[PDB]
């Protein structure tokens, strides 16, 4: 259920769990939606509402990209996501949801990472994590603004090793995606 995000000087690395639902065992990613060719969204929280919200956001962003024949900036995407999340709970009990948005602004050629909680509080962060009750110790002590992609991957591997030290066999693994100037890639070895 843990979602992680590290913003290195030229890339965004998003990590998520593989799959877990109720007490049902499955083999089988269903927690990351590609909003834009250079913008990715990772969502965690209650099952049933988070997926619907992510699909709604992805549909809206794809419609905007089709209409304008242009790619919306990660900041505008984050603002739209925050507004939609705040609107969704304006007339009902709030549901647990945490969203990490990682993008690469082409106009400024800069990676960006944003975190939105269940009430709709968008915060721009160099690194972010949810679902862990800590893990910020490694993310704070060994973080630099000028870290390369390899260094960020090594830090993420250290965090994953820490996770795979106090968890049962249910921890299948970690799915890792990288957003940079060349687009969105998936990391298999790490």
């Amino acid at each position: 259920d843990i979602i992680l995000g590290i913003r290195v000087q030229d890339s965004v690395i998003l990590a998520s769990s593989k799959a877990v639902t109720r007490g049902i065992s499955v083999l089988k990613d269903d927690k990351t939606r590609q909003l834009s060719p250079h913008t990715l969204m990772s969502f965690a929280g209650e099952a049933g509402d988070t997926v619907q919200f992510a699909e709604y956001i992805q549909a809206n962003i794809q419609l905007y990209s089709i209409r304008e024949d242009y790619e919306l900036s990660p900041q505008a995407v984050s603002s739209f996501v925050r507004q939609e999340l705040a609107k969704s709970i304006r007339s009902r009990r709030p549901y647990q949801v945490n969203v990490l948005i990682g993008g690469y602004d082409k106009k400024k050629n800069k990676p960006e990472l944003y975190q939105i909680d269940y009430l709709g509080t968008k915060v721009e962060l160099p690194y972010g994590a949810h679902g862990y009750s800590y893990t910020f110790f490694l993310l704070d002590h060994h973080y630099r603004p000028d870290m390369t992609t390899e260094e960020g991957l090594d830090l993420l591997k250290l965090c994953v090793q820490e996770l795979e030290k106090r968890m049962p066999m249910d921890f299948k693994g970690v799915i890792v995606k990288i957003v940079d100037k060349d687009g969105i890639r998936q990391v298999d070895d790490f």
């Binding site: 709970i89 304006r90 007339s91 009902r92 009990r93 709030p94 009430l119």
Partner: protein, 212 residues
């Protein structure tokens, strides 16, 4: 449209998760006087030592409120706008009975969820009027009325020294004495006294800091 109910469920969810004055009115033989204290407290702390608690609905119709301050101010302003529009439409001096009816119906519409307890005094061509209005939509008529946390001392003073035929000066003195007793004997009342006197055929006289 109107007052919103959005984020009501969100507010309840946050609450479940640990996320958180003396007024008198005296009617004398040719008019009405309304007096109030001038201290605003945010609990134990005195926020303001000189606050105007006498609000105006019409040039010759004034009121003073208690309960929820925002609700009292909003309802008074809305009724003032309605009264001004009605007077412009009819080209006549507004009546205290019309303001009473509008306030009563508006307060009964919300079934007591708008907390505003008012003393409304005024003078219109039919005479002088003084009413007390409850937050649920019930109104009462009297010759002398008191309101607020210091209303008991004020009522004692009014009962001590009230007569049928009172002059303007006697009524002003009686209202000032009632507010002074409320100020001295009640912790929530203090500072100065604000007075508003309304006679028949004369402009309303508004005296801030009548007794400092």
């Amino acid at each position: 449209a109107g007052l919103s109910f959005d984020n009501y469920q969100r507010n309840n969810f946050l609450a479940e998760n640990s996320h958180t004055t003396t007024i008198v009115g005296v009617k004398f033989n040719n008019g009405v006087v309304i007096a109030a204290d001038t201290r605003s407290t945010q609990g134990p702390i005195v926020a303001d030592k000189n606050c105007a608690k006498l609000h105006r609905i019409s040039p010759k119709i004034w009121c003073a409120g208690a309960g929820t301050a925002a609700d009292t101010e909003a309802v008074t302003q809305l009724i003032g706008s309605n009264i001004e529009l009605h007077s412009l439409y009819t080209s006549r001096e507004p009546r205290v009975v019309s303001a009473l009816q509008m306030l009563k119906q508006h307060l009964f519409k919300y079934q007591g969820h708008i907390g505003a307890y008012l003393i409304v005094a005024g003078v219109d061509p039919t005479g002088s009027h003084l009413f007390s209005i409850h937050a649920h939509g019930s109104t009462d008529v009297g010759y002398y009325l008191s309101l607020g946390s210091g209303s008991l001392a004020a009522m004692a003073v009014l009962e001590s020294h009230w007569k049928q035929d009172l002059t303007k000066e006697e009524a002003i003195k009686l209202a000032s004495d009632a507010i002074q007793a409320g100020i001295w004997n009640d912790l929530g009342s203090g500072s100065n006294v604000d007075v508003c006197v309304m006679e028949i055929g004369k402009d309303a006289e508004y005296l801030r800091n009548y007794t400092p």
